[PDB]
Amino acid sequence: PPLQAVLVADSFDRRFFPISKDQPRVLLPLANVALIDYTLEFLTATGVQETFVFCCWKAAQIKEHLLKSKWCRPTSLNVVRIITSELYRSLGDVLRDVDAKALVRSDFLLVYGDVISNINITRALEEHRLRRKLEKNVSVMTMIFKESSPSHPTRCHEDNVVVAVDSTTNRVLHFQKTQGLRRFAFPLSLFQGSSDGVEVRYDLLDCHISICSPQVAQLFTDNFDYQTRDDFVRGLLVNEEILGNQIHMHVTAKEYGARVSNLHMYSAVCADVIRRWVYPLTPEANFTDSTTQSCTHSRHNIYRGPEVSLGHGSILEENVLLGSGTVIGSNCFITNSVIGPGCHIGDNVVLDQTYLWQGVRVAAGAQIHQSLLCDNAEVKERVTLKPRSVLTSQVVVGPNITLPEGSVISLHPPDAEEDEDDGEFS
């Protein structure tokens, strides 16, 4: 049987604002490569023969971005199907559109468009097919989690996930998040329904690579109230003797898998990509065959592109990526940072935990900590940036203007905190 996949290239939450008002979240680059390219490379290395990409907002930009990629070439083994509609606004709308179109056949993957992973899930699909052949198509969804300590900066407090499963047969019995909960409540019918074994798990980072049966689309066609994934599992687990459908689980300990929904998830996943945690998917390997993204791997995870033209006194110590044509001045100090292609850096600067995208221009004397600079940006001299600052789509910051900790400045007034100019004061 072939391997189908559904890719949700539009996560419908209002989190990357107003970064998403310029370019959708799946087109934002971690290290000069968009997230949909990472997801398509993960799907092609998985063994998926056909994908179904779904795009709602700014969909023409996504289409013209991925049409010139590696996966829509005729030499691609993984064929894609670009499906767009201005009507759907949720993941359940996507899955009921799949059920109305009848695209998949059996045992299809379901994934978002901003999932970073390198898991080969053939063992999980073997277990899912064996359970479907044994229980006569009773088990429906096989969720995939990664073992992780809860103190890790990857899993933030917005989507820390605690489950209650079986350790014998790996079926999911309870699922909840920790969105503002000090004491967690668990039901009691899971112990009476399974007296052979039960375990609670807080060590599971959610990768959102839930491989499914087409009964997921059936239940999404029936239940119109199921808006997204955790709605579906929270409605499926509390109703067991009606619409039985026991969800099973797979745990990965030797491969990486995550997604992004914050600046924190973006920064942690980017720091894991630069520190090669998602090997083989590394920026110097150039899994997307493009001459403007190939790099060379030096010591201490220093990735250098072509024609960089470093200056005297500029030191790169740890986890630095330099794109194509980014010029760097003298006496610089860059660490733990990703620099885009075609940038301009001044003199006597520090850049730690920062994400500079393409086309930016940094003047001399600028001190940037833990920030994010989007495309075509600019900053003058005598500026020092604080942690968790967002600069978005050519915002100019004038001299003698230090930003606070909470700082998001964009061209849109009400979505950001302010709108800047040649002078930062109004």
Next chain:
Amino acid sequence: LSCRFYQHKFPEVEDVVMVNVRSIAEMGAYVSLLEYNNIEGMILLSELSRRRIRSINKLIRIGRNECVVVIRVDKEKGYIDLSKRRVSPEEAIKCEDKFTKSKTVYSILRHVAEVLEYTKDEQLESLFQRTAWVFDDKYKRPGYGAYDAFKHAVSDPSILDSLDLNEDEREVLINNINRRLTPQAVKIRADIEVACYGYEGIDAVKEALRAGLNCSTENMPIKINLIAPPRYVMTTTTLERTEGLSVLSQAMAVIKEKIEEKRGVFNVQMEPKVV
């Protein structure tokens, strides 16, 4: 209990033979001629390749079968000079196919003599000369003629009735030939998704299925089955699978034309492949 493969005990000059290397010496590589009752030959050190060869063991591979061309033969001295340099890949493939057909004929006559319980090698050689070498001398083709006569006798046994070996030996040879060289069985299965979302959808689907079943040739019935609601399986259990795949492709094209004439889609879920 063994014998040679052809009526001659020694190969002719420039005749490519299939050998297996038994040992390596300084003068060359000692081989055994598998189609001439394991007589000893020698591939020369100068004839092992067209390139300068430092050592004989780099390309000998004692235990591997190889095609070598005969350069010099001496029936009195017992010297057979062989050469791997002179043989071409086309001649190597020809010698491999000829050795495979001659080994199949040798196994068939060995099974026939084991059924006849002829423990003597002279009676087995007389059976060889009465079954295969007579056809090889009549058609003037060693290996090809006997295999062609056996492939014709597996279909029409009138060629086996001309052999005057015995009353039971001819029947045992015909049974061994029909059990060894007559495995004419194949199943070219294919999946096709033909449907019609129109007025007479099921009627046009049944008409396309009847038009596909009507295009089935003789001794090759294209059996259609409903594997799914939108998908169908068009199997064909018949011999000559190179023609059976073409017949299945023609039936699928006729079904697609009958589906498109009645305003219905017709996708090919699977091409014509053997089961």
Next chain:
Amino acid sequence: MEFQAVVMAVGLPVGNKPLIWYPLNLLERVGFEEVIVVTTRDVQKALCAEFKMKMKPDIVCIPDDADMGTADSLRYIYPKLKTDVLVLSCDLITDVALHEVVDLFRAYDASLAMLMRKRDFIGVDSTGKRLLFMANEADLDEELVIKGSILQKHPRIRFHTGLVDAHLYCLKKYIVDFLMENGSITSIRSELIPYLVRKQFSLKSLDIYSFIKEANTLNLAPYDACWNACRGDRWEDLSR
């Protein structure tokens, strides 16, 4: 001396042999040269004369009151204990090698170490030895609650449902000191378990350990487990 074994009798020798003989024999096998035994007075205050008719080396039988509990039983013998307390019961015939719970009491320096053998839902850490939670619906209004600090410090907790308490504990000195300082406890099986399980969820803290055996099982006070006691003693007491 490291331990002072205390055998409880709260409602007894109804079977093929005396019910007091198996715990005492188990104790007198591996050490335990002096045993403190508590007599029963709820059903009848005359079993102590039946307790002094055995052939052990040394027994300490004391009279007790009728309306009393296990926590009151430990508070009654408080000025006569100077070391760690190892609590037992009468209706507990176990083929389990006793040294596992004592090894877990010594190796990690635990504050309480207990033995179970396959109602009360328990949660024990993935190592299989240190417990973290235990509760029943006799005292729970809500279904089940888990503290956040024990999930931050221990991310996976294996829960068990069919485990029953064999009533073989290992108390320290300060546990019995706090039990004597807090007279509100009457049943120590529901007091020393749950309060110490709550206080362990605080660095510098206390350790609680448990051994889940798979060799035999204990008995009960009622007649539900009185039919298997003779079948256990007919095939397990031949080696002892």
Next chain:
Amino acid sequence: LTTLDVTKLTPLSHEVISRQATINIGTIGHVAHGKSTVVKAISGVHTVRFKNELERNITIKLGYANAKIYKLNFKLVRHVSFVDCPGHDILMATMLNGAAVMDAALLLIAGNESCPQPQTSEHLAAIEIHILILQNKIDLVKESQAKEQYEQILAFVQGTVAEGAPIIPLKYNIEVVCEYIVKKIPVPPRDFTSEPRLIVIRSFDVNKPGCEVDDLKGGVAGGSILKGVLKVGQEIEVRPGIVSKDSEGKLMCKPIFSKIVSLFAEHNDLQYAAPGGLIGVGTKIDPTLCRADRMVGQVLGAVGALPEIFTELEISYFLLRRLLGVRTEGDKKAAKVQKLSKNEVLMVNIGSLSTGGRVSAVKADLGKIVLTNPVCTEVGEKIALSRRVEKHWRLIGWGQIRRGVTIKPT
């Protein structure tokens, strides 16, 4: 065996020539999986078995069970269709959405106690509407059943203000209840002269796996006839049809016309089919177009029904304050239907069409619910509105369709 034919000009509801589907008798009580056993004791356990599949919508679909109540080698005159829907709120939203639905309500009462499930059943029967009370708790003591019948008659005396005048306190009791239902429930007036509209509730596939090329049965749909008469050979008109969004925008609904090859009920039905039963039509439809409950929610008209496929319906939002008859011992703000918030899913049950819709906009008298699937009932029909309270779809309000946005492709 029956002796029906295709010779009919003006049939009646109580016609003895059909003997397949005469009237419908709804049932809403305090069953908790007890009404199916009562319907099997009244009609038959394995009597209704035509085409089974995987249970897709258990609580959203209503199950019909035919019962040929005979009298006197017995003689049959009228049959009753037992409509046992899972969940009393689904049967209440279907009955209170127009006309000719749940004609003979049967209040399955229990002689054990007077719990709140019977109060919710009485509230649903009052919101739907001829009631038929029946005590199901058989095999009790005489004084205990007398006190329970006194308590039930005291509860039904408060029920007698609205509709509370049935009286019934194991096979003999079922036969007496069947005789009382045959003597009490009158023949309801059904419109036979109109066009046949078969609202599909559960579709099935009659083609088995690995069938022959010529022996292919496609599109064995199943539903309920609202009004009219459906004959074999008439071209049915699926008004919803195939909804396709391949134009990258507003989805177009192509109506697929299919010739009705047969009208197959639970028994071997004739060519003519009347309303008041689970009418099964095997038409000339493809198997992919009519999969397992794929063609549900489609109004299978006969003469080109006027109801067009609406994508967004603006109706009059009129929600109740509390739930009808649902009040537990706690009642800690549970029976309180909230206002229609934006982007909220609602299960609008227009007659038999139970379609989901998001609340796009509403200003104090009218909510413009954008439906997920295309629905086509009428331009001013009584549309209900439900909401999942706690793992169960419960009714929250009713209204009248004030405006719509129609679309009809070809």
Next chain:
Amino acid sequence: GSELSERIESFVETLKRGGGPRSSEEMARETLGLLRQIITDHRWSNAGELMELIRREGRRMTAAQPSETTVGNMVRRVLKIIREEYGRLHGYAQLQSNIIEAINELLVELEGTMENIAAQALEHIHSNEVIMTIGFSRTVEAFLKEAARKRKFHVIVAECAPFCQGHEMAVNLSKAGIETTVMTDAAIFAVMSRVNKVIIGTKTILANGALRAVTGTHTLALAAKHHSTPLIVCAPMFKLSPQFPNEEDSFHKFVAPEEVLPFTEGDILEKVSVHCPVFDYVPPELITLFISNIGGNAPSYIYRLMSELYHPDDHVL
């Protein structure tokens, strides 16, 4: 045609994603079959046009994976074979069948490599010997498992910390009964006082006699040079590369750091820098002897095999 580029792109992303196939002799056979498919599915008038073509696809195939040199040196060996045939035919139309039969000769040379090393293996093993190896390689385990047929000795298979592949070598040599001792990678100088000689494999032999191999073996070579024990590098001649060590810093292959420090370590993974190089560099002065299928060679002789198998005009590829 198109199927050629299908197979080429499949080979390219197979090398890009993981190790497909597992061992190297199958990969060399795949590379030679792909190269004969490239020379049998094209049209050319001069040999230089096919030379530029093969240089371009060699650049592509080594840009797929710069750490694995077998495809690149196989492309370079095919290039030198084409150059030798053009030189011997220049001093025209029969060139293609000559390259076909030369590739067939290279395939017969390549299939009988490990068994030739096994045939010459008895010239390096005496009775009651202490052998220490590193990593896992089928050549060295075949070497030892057939050298134990007439001799009795001891092999100490030391595991490597990123992927303990020496456990497979230990359970494969223990089935033959060579008294296998399993140790870690930290006790090598702790056991170098008793190891008589070191018989290891490698991944790539460099042009100056140096070699990249499984990581931790430069430490083993340093300890064996300290104890003056001879080193036996049982290596075939398709792992021979002209790539110099100091060349654009593209030496080591770094993999995911999960095998060194797991993801369940805590919040301390953010402020730590974990590297996992699976290969290591050994200079030729720490190597005593190479064992190829043509015999034993010195590290002072790798330049002659380099000039005999490769051309200096094809080092840039």
